[PDB]
Amino acid sequence: DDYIHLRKWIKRIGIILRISGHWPFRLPHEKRNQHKSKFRQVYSCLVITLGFITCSCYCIGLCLSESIAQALNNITVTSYFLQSCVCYVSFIINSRKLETLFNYLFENEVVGCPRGYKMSSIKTTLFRCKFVAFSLGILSFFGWLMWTLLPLAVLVQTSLRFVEAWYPFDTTTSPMNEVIAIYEAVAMIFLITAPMSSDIMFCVLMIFIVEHLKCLGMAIECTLKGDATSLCNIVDSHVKIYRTMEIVQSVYSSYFATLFFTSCLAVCALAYFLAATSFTRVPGMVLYLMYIFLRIFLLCLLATEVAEQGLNLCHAGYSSKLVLASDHVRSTIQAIATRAQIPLSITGARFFTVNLSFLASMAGVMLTYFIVLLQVN
Amino acid sequence: DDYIHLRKWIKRIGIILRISGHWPFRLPHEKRNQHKSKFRQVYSCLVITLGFITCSCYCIGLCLSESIAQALNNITVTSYFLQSCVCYVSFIINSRKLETLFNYLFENEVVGCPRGYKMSSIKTTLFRCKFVAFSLGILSFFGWLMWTLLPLAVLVQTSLRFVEAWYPFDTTTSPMNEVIAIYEAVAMIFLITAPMSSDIMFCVLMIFIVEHLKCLGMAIECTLKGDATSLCNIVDSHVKIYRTMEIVQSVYSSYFATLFFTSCLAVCALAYFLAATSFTRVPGMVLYLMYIFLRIFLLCLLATEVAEQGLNLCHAGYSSKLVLASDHVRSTIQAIATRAQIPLSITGARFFTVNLSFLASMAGVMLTYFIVLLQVN
Amino acid sequence: DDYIHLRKWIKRIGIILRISGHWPFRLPHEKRNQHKSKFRQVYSCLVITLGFITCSCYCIGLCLSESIAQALNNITVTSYFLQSCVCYVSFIINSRKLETLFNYLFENEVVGCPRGYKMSSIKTTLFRCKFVAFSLGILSFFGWLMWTLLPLAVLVQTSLRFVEAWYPFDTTTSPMNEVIAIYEAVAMIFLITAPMSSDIMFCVLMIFIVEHLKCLGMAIECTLKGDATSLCNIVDSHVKIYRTMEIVQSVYSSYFATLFFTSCLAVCALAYFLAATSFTRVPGMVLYLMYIFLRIFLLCLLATEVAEQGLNLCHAGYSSKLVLASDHVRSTIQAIATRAQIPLSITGARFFTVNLSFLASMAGVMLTYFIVLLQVN
Amino acid sequence: DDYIHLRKWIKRIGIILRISGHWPFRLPHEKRNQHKSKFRQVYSCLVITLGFITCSCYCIGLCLSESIAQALNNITVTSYFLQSCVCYVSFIINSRKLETLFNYLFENEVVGCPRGYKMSSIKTTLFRCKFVAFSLGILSFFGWLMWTLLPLAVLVQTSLRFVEAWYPFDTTTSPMNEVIAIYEAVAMIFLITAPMSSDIMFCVLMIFIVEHLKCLGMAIECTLKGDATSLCNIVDSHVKIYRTMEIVQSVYSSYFATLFFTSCLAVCALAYFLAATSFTRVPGMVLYLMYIFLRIFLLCLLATEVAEQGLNLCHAGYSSKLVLASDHVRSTIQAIATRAQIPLSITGARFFTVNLSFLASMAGVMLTYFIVLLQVN
């Protein structure tokens, strides 16, 4: 039933990842080696070299510092573009571990859990992944729309760029402004759709791992309430969880680091420009602020959820029946517990572990720095 | 003897919770389904919709920002009202887990502990719960009295509101001021009595859980000094402790988060208004400052006490007799210890774990922020 | 041999504690109930009521705030006096646990350790305790000397008080200044000798506990290299270590809290007065700064040493022979390790755990606060 | 094959350490007691007394504070020289533990690991140690070259000192400036080559320990997939790892502490001089900034790598076969895991544990302090 619909959803996950111009890899429903086709490779290289030249144009526009007052006005845009750049190279560096992750995410049936839990698990996973995917997609589309379309609509020269960008031609005359306008429009579309897609895939992985942990705990209490075989299957599922989390930690680290850094810098610049300096500008800046904050909050929440479920897995099979089991179960449960005491955490290039606590600390120091450097100055 | 008096006290706990206008649930001494009576439901809905309209009136008075200098003068009052709002919805969202918690708190006799410890336990619990309940009740009553009655007594128009609030009528003329005065008086009474009641119930739960932990440790050393049955009873009591703490964590998280946030913001505003700006105002503001600080300190203390008693439970039954026991006791004690190494902590919406250490850190950053932003500016 | 000299040293420890006016308790070499003698009790009550009236005089001199600029000039002196006050009441509240601690510290021979380690242990303990005791005593004597004697010597009225203090008589005329000078001199002598004595006793306890831990580790490796009896003796010694550390945590908490707080406040005031405001004053203030810093550093070092030795005790008996021992040793060593994973830490009223890391954090925030509030202002 | 080349490399490590003027100790390829030769001892004493007199000259030049504005201009140079001083005495205090460390680092073959892993291990270790050694050597040589040669080349008096230094002769006249120029040139050469050499040896030790940990994990999974003997060899190798890490912690602590402290102070001074105050100066200061940052980053990275590999060693041999092994393996693996839960961390004089997280925190507070104290002031 809905198990087929979930597989259609994770097929859509691969499809939207191929649309955004990442390097294509083998999907689970791919048995003809179509992931090395000419069309997809040409599309990928075209979109990534367009993103690379646009980001370099904005960076050299930054290095051609017009003044300090507009410099922060540049930062944020280049900030977001920088993220896209990093994300691209990451998906080309580790394009086999992604195949491994999708192969895990296609079939993850832990054996022994009761069915009444399994169907509710499928329902809850479908609901939450639909919610997060639709939310981030709508927010990204509205972000592009507000950041690109509106100043064109003020005119109908186009003079729509929220900050000016370096170009070979001067972009001053009436034909050139229009050409650079349409070029920047399609460019920023294909740039904004990349980190949204990577974020959506990370959130899907986190949701699936959380539900697999809860089903593993249910299987543990089920085999305790009931000799060797169930424990072997449970231990295999747990070590598979750990290896999958290790792979996810291996791929996402640099992207998380650059995301956190350039995001807090862009929010500081955005507050500096919105606070004391002078009607059309405020919708775009408030929408970009919400686009940063909601994304960071979703990442921190779905990163803390898996660690909480691991420490919940620590308290599994801990009842009176444990005092009446054999020595074999009494030792294997001990082994599972002392392995579960290690926290399954994701860190950004080993600089910081992404939790809700790190979000609170970063928000505290960012609020502090912004409010002092704008108020006493 | 006093075991009956303690049950009368926890009946009073339910009674004062019903008085403050929360949604009524089944008490342990309720065998006629009176918790769904018409009178109690009508009273609950009336008080909560009055609180909801008053909080919205103060919030729209805030959004109608008269000036910045009076804006902080608004914040604190709306701050406290905000807490009440959140608390209301929480007790209606989880109105069955509260029944479960009261059913646990009515009978919690751990089997095997010596009687000489049990009677002293009853005595100490009665003393401490009486102390905390009377202290918070007297402080809340004096807080309302000072914040409402005195500026009326300066007159006998009433012109008593410590900050003006938005209303449909202008409240300027002499009849209207009096009507809004009595309305705000009864409103703030029924608003102040809610978080005090929730705090008192949380403190009662924490005290009972702490004493149950100490009795569990006494039972562990008793059954070690003395085969299977006592260990099963001890493990069952421990896992019951853990499930109860999980339920308490599940209900109180949003309230703790909003409490900490809007409380530190209100204290910052209160210091800004008391420090450098201009005899009647100072008693009310110092009493509100004490009302914030003592409440936060009581919460942090009774939250750290249970974690300390858990880590104390880690060092249970650890003597020479452990080296002479069977393998069975030697494995079950190991299991109890490695489960007890997990800290039983309460966190506010998983943002921060409420300890004395978090109170010290928050007080440090609050003192820092206030003293810099008032002194160098 | 030197074992007798060490007992003479810990007798001197009790003697200097009786000299400073604490409430007398039973020493180990006291078999005639002389700790309840009339002379010692009269001396104790006289010195503590003199300290209590002098501290209250300085506190009411503070509350009679002459100006803000001299107010910080008051703080530090009252700061130190405050510590003395707290220390007094603590030693009268728990005057039996101190007897228990001294009874432990008199005989602590762990059985089974090799003799070549035991004699070197006695030597190292004697050396380090002599060092710390002589250092703190000389520093305290020079602190009193510089803070009291020198401005009298500038004259030979006395006009020597580094900050003026409230008194019933005006202290302005020539007879009164001299009388208050000699009164404050003997008062500050008997006040300064109290926290130095408590600190010296704490340092002696920490040194003895550290050396006992190292000898316990040596005994563990000795009985592993060599069946039941040695393990029972080792476990008994370890749990005795834990109970002693619990008692030390129970007594010293309030004193550590007030010490850290009023010490960092006094150092901030001292820096404010020394930095930008105007030859005789600078020796006293630099000596008081060193007296604060060296004391705090000694406390943090000898507090971190015991935790490091506990985590060193975690890695005990971990060799190839563990793989060839019986199941009995293999389980008891596991129990010792999983108990040793709990850190033996001292905390100040459960607000913060005194480590070198807390000293680094406090020094960082203190340096920050001082340098900003003096420079940008 | 390359095993001989690696031994030639670690011979070069000893050779470059002898060149920089440290006190010579016995190398593994030294069977004639040549480490106590007259030539090497004379060279060592000459270079260290030259470093000692130059550092004291710069320190007394600092204490002869010309003005505040040039004072920070002094700090950095004295800062670096201070490190050299400390490093010298450390290598003379513990000149036997270094022999022990080199004797470990010469032969570290863990028995039982598969050969296909061992050859790749040798290859990866050779690559990474070559990389780090060549990088730090080239950076140090260019640092000396820019900091000494260029202002001489501006002339061809010499007037090349980036900050003036105290000397017995006035250094003002034309002969004296040249003599002090050549003296300071050879001095700063022999001073800069010391902490680079100590850093290179620390990095080699960290790389070898990391690879030994990975090979130990491979040996664990190999002996689990395959009775007593392999486990004894594995446990012996693990405890040898722990003792080696303890020795490295014992020697490097004071050097790490002084490095972190005087390095962040020098970077703050360097930013203060580069930011707002006035073409030749900027290459030297940017090269010194890179020389500080890259060194600190390399140290933090190779310090965090070993802790990550230890927590990776925690998850060793955790498969289904563990559920089918004997009780003996099931207990020894448990012992290995609960010992591996202790983090193998290096700390700087027990003030702070050097991780990437401490680098992030220090960079945050340094950025904060610099930007506030330069901007609002």
Author numbering:
A (entry chain A), B (entry chain B), C (entry chain C), D (entry chain D): 12 to 167, 178 to 247, 317 to 368, 371 to 469
Show the paper's wording.
MhORs thus autonomously assemble as homotetrameric odorant-gated ion channels and display the divergent chemical tuning profiles typical of this receptor family. Using cryo-electron microscopy, we elucidated the structure of MhOR5 in multiple gating states, alone and in complex with two of its agonists—the odorant eugenol and the insect repellent DEET. As in Orco, each MhOR5 subunit contributes a single helix (S7b) to the central ion conduction pathway, and their S0–S6 helices form a loosely packed domain that projects radially away from the pore axis.
We used single-particle cryo-electron microscopy (cryo-EM) to elucidate the structure of the MhOR5 tetramer. We obtained a density map at 3.3 Å resolution, which allowed us to unambiguously build a model for the majority of the protein, with the exception of several extra-membranous loops and the short intracellular N terminus and extracellular C terminus. Within the membrane, the contacts between MhOR5 subunits are minimal and confined to the pore, whereas about 75% of the residues that form inter-subunit interactions reside within the intracellular ‘anchor’ domain, formed from the intertwined S4–S7 helices of all four subunits. Analogous to the Orco structure, the tightly packed anchor domain of MhOR5 exhibited the highest local resolution, consistent with a structural role in stabilizing the loosely assembled S0–S6 transmembrane domains within the lipid bilayer. In the apo structure, the S7b helices coalesce to form the narrowest portion of the ion conduction pathway. In particular, Val468 protrudes into the channel lumen, generating a hydrophobic constriction measuring about 5.3 Å in diameter, and thus serves as a gate to impede the flow of hydrated ions through the quadrivial pore. In the apo structure, the density for some of these amino acids was diffuse, which could be attributed to the overall lower resolution of this structure or to conformational flexibility when no odorant is bound. The lower resolution of the apo pocket precluded us from defining the path that eugenol takes to enter the pocket, as in the bound structure the pocket is not obviously accessible to solvent, or from determining whether the cavity is partially occupied in the absence of an added ligand.
